[PDB]
Amino acid sequence: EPLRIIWGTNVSIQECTTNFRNFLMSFKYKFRKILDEREEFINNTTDEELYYIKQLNEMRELGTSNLNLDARNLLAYKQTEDLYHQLLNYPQEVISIMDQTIKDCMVSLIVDNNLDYDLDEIETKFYKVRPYNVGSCKGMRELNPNDIDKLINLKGLVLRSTPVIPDMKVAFFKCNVCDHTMAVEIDRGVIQEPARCERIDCNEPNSMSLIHNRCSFADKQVIKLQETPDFVPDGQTPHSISLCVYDELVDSCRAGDRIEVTGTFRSIPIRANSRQRVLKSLYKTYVDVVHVKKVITDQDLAKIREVAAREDLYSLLARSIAPSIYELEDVKKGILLQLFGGTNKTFTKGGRYRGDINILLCGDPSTSKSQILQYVHKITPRGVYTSGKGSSAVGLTAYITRDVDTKQLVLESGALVLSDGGVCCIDEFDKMSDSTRSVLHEVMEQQTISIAKAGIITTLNARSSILASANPIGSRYNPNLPVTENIDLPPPLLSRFDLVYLVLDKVDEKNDRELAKHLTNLYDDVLPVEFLTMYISYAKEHIHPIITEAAKTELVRAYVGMRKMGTATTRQLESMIRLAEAHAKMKLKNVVELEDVQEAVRLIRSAIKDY
Amino acid sequence: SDEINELKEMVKDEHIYDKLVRSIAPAVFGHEAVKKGILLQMLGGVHKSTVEGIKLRGDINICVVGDPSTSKSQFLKYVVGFAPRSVYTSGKASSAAGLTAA
DNA sequence: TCGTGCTGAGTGATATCTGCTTTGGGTGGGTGGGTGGGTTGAGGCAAT
DNA sequence: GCAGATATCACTCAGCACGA
Ligand SMILES: Nc1ncnc2c1ncn2[C@@H]1O[C@H](COP(=O)(O)OP(=O)(O)O)[C@@H](O)[C@H]1O
Numbered sequence: 001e002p003l004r005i006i007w008g009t010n011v012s013i014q015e016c017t018t019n020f021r022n023f024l025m026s027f028k029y030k031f032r033k034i035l036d037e038r039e040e041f042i043n044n045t046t047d048e049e050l051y052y053i054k055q056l057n058e059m060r061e062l063g064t065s066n067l068n069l070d071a072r073n074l075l076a077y078k079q080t081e082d083l084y085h086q087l088l089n090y091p092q093e094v095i096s097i098m099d100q101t102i103k104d105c106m107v108s109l110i111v112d113n114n115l116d117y118d119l120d121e122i123e124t125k126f127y128k129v130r131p132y133n134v135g136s137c138k139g140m141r142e143l144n145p146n147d148i149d150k151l152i153n154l155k156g157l158v159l160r161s162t163p164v165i166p167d168m169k170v171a172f173f174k175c176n177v178c179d180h181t182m183a184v185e186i187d188r189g190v191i192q193e194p195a196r197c198e199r200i201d202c203n204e205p206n207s208m209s210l211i212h213n214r215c216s217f218a219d220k221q222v223i224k225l226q227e228t229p230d231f232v233p234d235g236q237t238p239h240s241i242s243l244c245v246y247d248e249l250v251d252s253c254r255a256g257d258r259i260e261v262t263g264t265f266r267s268i269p270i271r272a273n274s275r276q277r278v279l280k281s282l283y284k285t286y287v288d289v290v291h292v293k294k295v296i297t298d299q300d301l302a303k304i305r306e307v308a309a310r311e312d313l314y315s316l317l318a319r320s321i322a323p324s325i326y327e328l329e330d331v332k333k334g335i336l337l338q339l340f341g342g343t344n345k346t347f348t349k350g351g352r353y354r355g356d357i358n359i360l361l362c363g364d365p366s367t368s369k370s371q372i373l374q375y376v377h378k379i380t381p382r383g384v385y386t387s388g389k390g391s392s393a394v395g396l397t398a399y400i401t402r403d404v405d406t407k408q409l410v411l412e413s414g415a416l417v418l419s420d421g422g423v424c425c426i427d428e429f430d431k432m433s434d435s436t437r438s439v440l441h442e443v444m445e446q447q448t449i450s451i452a453k454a455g456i457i458t459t460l461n462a463r464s465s466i467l468a469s470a471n472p473i474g475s476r477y478n479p480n481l482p483v484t485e486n487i488d489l490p491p492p493l494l495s496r497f498d499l500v501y502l503v504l505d506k507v508d509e510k511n512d513r514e515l516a517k518h519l520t521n522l523y524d525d526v527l528p529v530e531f532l533t534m535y536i537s538y539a540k541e542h543i544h545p546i547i548t549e550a551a552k553t554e555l556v557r558a559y560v561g562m563r564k565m566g567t568a569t570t571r572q573l574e575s576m577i578r579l580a581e582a583h584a585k586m587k588l589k590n591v592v593e594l595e596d597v598q599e600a601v602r603l604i605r606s607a608i609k610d611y
Numbered sequence: 612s613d614e615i616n617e618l619k620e621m622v623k624d625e626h627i628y629d630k631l632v633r634s635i636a637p638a639v640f641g642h643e644a645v646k647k648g649i650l651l652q653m654l655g656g657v658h659k660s661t662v663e664g665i666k667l668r669g670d671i672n673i674c675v676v677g678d679p680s681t682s683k684s685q686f687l688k689y690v691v692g693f694a695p696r697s698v699y700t701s702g703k704a705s706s707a708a709g710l711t712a713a
Numbered sequence: 714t715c716g717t718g719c720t721g722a723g724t725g726a727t728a729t730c731t732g733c734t735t736t737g738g739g740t741g742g743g744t745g746g747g748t749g750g751g752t753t754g755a756g757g758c759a760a761t
Numbered sequence: 762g763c764a765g766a767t768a769t770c771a772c773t774c775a776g777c778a779c780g781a
Pocket residue numbers: 324325326327364365366367368369370371515519
């Protein structure tokens with residue numbers, strides 16, 4: 001009875017397998033809570049259930065071959081305390097054992113439960129475990145030779161990833177004489193080639209050839225990770241570490257993302273020259289990744305639908321979008337309606353119509369303009385905080401360049417293009433040369449940018465909302481002169497903006513007193529931002545308002561009345577349509593009512609301000 | 612044969628000219644002169660080469676000037692979406708090259 | 714009924730042999746060195 | 762002096778037919 005043992009140690013593999021099988025078979029999350037001194041938080045439904053059994057059953061129903069594992073869960077159990085150390089110190093063997101045990105557990109679950117599930121699908125499926133949360137996150141500048149071939153945890157920023165690389169798994173050989181085909185495995189990157197044909201009648205030596213296109217292959221990719229800027233001790237070039245990901249984890253992390261990766265810190269020789277077995281004494285270090293983490297339920301939907309019933313929903317959201325800003329309810333309301341956006345229309349026999357709202361916030365300096373810009377910049381999922389005189393005409397739209405790795409002509413995405421589907425933010429609109437402003441003419445009108453220069457003729461979608469701010473020519477705003485004089489900017493440009501607000505810092509004995517009491521307390525409830533983001537995302541994805549006849553009957557009246565009192569062009573009517581659609585989105589309605597359009601027109605007249 | 616029959620039925624109508632004028636750029640509202648210009652541009656003119664060898668142009672160029680917020684770009688988008696061969700370019704983005712041989 | 718000496722056949726280890734550069738390019742360097750060589754031109758973009 | 766691709770020679774083994 002030979003005993004299987006991991007090389008260089010005294011751990012019996014059968015013990016590991018049985019312990020892991022027992023842990024998977026009988027584990028309840030209550031143990032995890034007990035371990036962390038959270039005994040009083042134990043419930044009676046989720047913590048009294050077989051966790052990994054439900055995980056495996058869900059895997060089977062969804063047809064997946066992955067089970068994410070938590071090491072702290074291993075520490076929680078009784079029989080797998082030593083398994084945690086074994087996994088930490090000998091990751092490869094323990095990981096393989098865990099994968100095989102997971103497959104065996106699935107097979108046993110199917111067989112014992114007497115289910116009708118066919119065994120073929122599970123039998124031919126490769127199962128892999130992806131442990132994470134394996135201890136403290138080591139730094140990229142603290143990996144020593146001592147920590148070679150051990151499971152570590154890293155965090156960094158993705159810099160560049162190579163395309164998919166095919167990695168051979170099983171080779172295929174065919175005899176040139178008898179046309180006999182056999183498949184041989186690959187061990188440690190070496191093909192166990194046969195010397196002569198395996199058949200008995202035919203034994204011609206050296207007659208076997210490799211059929212390149214019939215060998216099984218896997219997926220390989222190489223990533224470069226740069227340490228977070230914070231870890232840099234004294235402002236030098238941040239270090240980088242290479243990573244390898246296979247099978248599912250391929251194409252899981254994009255360039256320019258913050259990730260936390262668990263893997264084995266491996267070492268490998270480098271050959272001195274191509275045509276010799278000679279090796280350099282210095283080894284290359286890299287990480288073999290086994291897990292990657294990029295750093296709606298019915299209950300939430302039932303909760304969200306409860307807020308919509310609230311009569312004062314408009315005020316609640318307007319007060320929660322920017323908690324700190326004081327007494328700017330109309331400005332907040334206008335800002336909020338931009339996040340929701342109008343309604344999207346797909347339209348053949350013409351062109352697409354997009355419900356995107358553009359807002360201008362021009363007023364006296366000390367008023368909270370930039371603060372609102374930053375506040376909205378945080379909420380939106382995509383956006384670029386471009387400023388005045390810090391951005392260029394090309395920089396906003398797109399830059400033509402070349403890819404050194406591929407040696408091909410490529411184009412980058414500018415600030416406006418990078419904000420596709422978000423809300424762009426501009427701080428100093430007046431302090432911007434008119435040459436660059438001409439770019440925004442097409443963005444706000446056609447929602448697209450077309451470039452034709454140096455052999456590149458293509459159009460990039462820029463379906464983004466613009467939120468810009470401007471300051472008066474003088475030190476303050478003078479009410480006496482008209483708007484077109486105080487704020488600069490071409491008169492026609494001001495007409496493009498859907499809403500153009502005017503916030504001024506008047507002097508009073510009570511407004512100033514209340515503002516001072518509000519900005520000094522730093523040394524009327526508001527929804528948590530986490531829930532608000534989900535609310536706006538759900539509204540933006542599911543709901544799609546459709547105008548009604550009552551809306552049109554009075555929208556014609558409103559537009560004609562706006563034009564009669566006299567600047568007022570068709571863009572104002574389209575803005576009214578977009579705003580009415582957006583407000584209906586807030587209340588989760590599929591039809592735009594008279595009240596919503598009334599609110600839209602109310603907002604428009606009271607923005608420029610009702611002298 | 613069926614398409615030919617439809618074509619000859621089209622030609623037979625004595626109100627063809629205004630019918631085509633109305634059909635062009637249906638999304639835009641009542642701009643008869645501009646639609647007529649776009650139609651005539653699409654049809655084009657006969658190009659000829661004299662006994663000399665010098666070539667007389669046969670194509671038509673049209674420039675639509677208007678105040679912002681008017682229906683200018685709508686016509687251009689319609690032409691791009693209808694003409695057999697055509698491209699869309701912007702004044703600011705375009706350069707000497709790209710708009711010509713590079 | 715059977716045992717053994719002679720033969721052709723085929724690997725194993727070992728003998729000579731060629732080669733020991735190689736290569737255009739800056740994530741191959743300049744403590745590898747110029748007797749191993751590298752000699753644009755248009756177009757785009759920031760600064761102003 | 763050193764690694765790799767290549768071809769050379771020598772030694773030993775399983776079959777065969779005959780004689781015991
Ligand atoms: N209504 C207000 N609510 C909260 N803070 C305010 C208000 N008005 C002024 N402030 C304060 O005054 C400062 C104005 O600066 P800033 O918002 O950068 O002005 P701007 O961006 O228009 O130049 C902010 O730091 C803010 O704390």
